[PDB]
Amino acid sequence: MNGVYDVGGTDGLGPINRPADEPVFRAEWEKVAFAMFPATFRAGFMGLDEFRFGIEQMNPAEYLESPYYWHWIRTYIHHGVRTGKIDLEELERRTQYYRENPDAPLPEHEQKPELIEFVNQAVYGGLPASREVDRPPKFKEGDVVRFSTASPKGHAKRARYVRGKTGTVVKHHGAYIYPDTAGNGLGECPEHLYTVRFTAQELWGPEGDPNSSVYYDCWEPYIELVDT
């Protein structure tokens, strides 16, 4: 989709705010928001590509200025409603309750050890997105290719600043989950993945550094041959 989160090349967002030191979690609610991801993933709220698509559908002004982990809360609620797993009216009633009773306890619950075992396995085992497919890669190192001008409204990894641009294939990585399908509830539909190099002048015109390039990852449908 063409949302404001696609910020590559955007001007006017202001100077970087980089405190000389910062904690991993700035408040207790951030730990909760962070740790909710394995819980909601295991419960079938969403996969990784769908998770990102939920963030992309935020109010753009809220996205630009809200704390990072609030984005995660928005996408949990988005997919909780999508899957019928979160009742909004109940959520709003509970929000008012904890507004008025911030120190009220959380519900009674069992500390199911298998949920912690799940956390440990995911963290140190990973969730690999690589997949085996039937066909060899269509492209190879050194091929000159052009990036698609398609502008889907659903999830994709098609930054506006690379659309229609010509670059050179740097590496073939194998096949991986395809975001244009996975993020839109259409399944993994794995495609071969490449890194493609675009010069700064190709991307930005004459305002481009003559000695800089951007390396961008392209699934196979994103690119078509210009010169072998």
Binding site: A35, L106, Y216
Partner: protein
């Protein structure tokens, strides 16, 4: 930056806190979330996983040419030699800074970061200011934001991490460190030097 429409930070935090506790209570009642699950995730990324792991990889590559070759050929497999890997570093590719090339990593679309070697990203890396600018004027950003002057004749490769490939910068070994131990060398390797926004520490 000033926005006349924006509530105070205190009011924003107060509202977020209630919304998060409310959602937490619902997922707890569904049986899919527990407070012990939350505490475990925080312990891992506060204390167990952080940039000291990537620093170990860098110093091994600096001191073992055969390991450096394996690291550049297959970053995930080489890091697994040291017991390092997992979530959000399933597919690592390490890239070598040289006298002719400087690498810097960004995720313009979605905050991608190699957690197993660096831990969770700092907030500036996730924020729109760095993400918008580094693909467009990396040389100027490095100079103005990080005090890092990359001579104009030197190529800057900006890796925009649009997939599950995770790019990690192998910074050059600082001069004046001949014969240093791996422990001493590690003190020079920062998360910034493995993103590419700074070189490894001088002196």
């Amino acid at each position: 930056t000033e926005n006349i429409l924006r509530k105070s930070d205190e009011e924003i935090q107060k509202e977020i806190t209630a919304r998060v506790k409310a959602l937490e209570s619902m997922l707890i009642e569904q049986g899919i979330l527990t407070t012990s699950m939350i505490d475990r995730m925080a312990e891992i990324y506060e204390n167990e996983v952080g940039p000291h792991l990537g620093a170990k990889v860098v110093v091994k590559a600096w001191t073992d040419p055969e390991f450096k070759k394996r690291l550049l050929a297959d970053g995930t497999e080489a890091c697994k030699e040291l017991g390092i890997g997992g979530l959000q570093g399933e597919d690592m590719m390490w890239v070598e800074n040289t006298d002719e090339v400087h690498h810097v990593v960004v995720c313009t679309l979605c905050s991608c970061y190699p957690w197993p070697v660096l831990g969770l990203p700092p907030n500036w890396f996730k924020e729109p200011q760095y993400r918008s600018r580094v693909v467009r004027e990396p040389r100027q950003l490095l100079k103005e934001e990080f005090g890092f002057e990359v001579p104009p004749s030197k190529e800057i490769k900006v890796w925009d991490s649009s997939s599950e490939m995770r790019f990690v910068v192998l910074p050059q070994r600082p001069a004046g460190t001949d014969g240093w131990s791996e422990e001493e060398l590690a003190t020079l390797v920062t998360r910034e030097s493995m993103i590419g926004v700074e070189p490894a520490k001088a002196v």
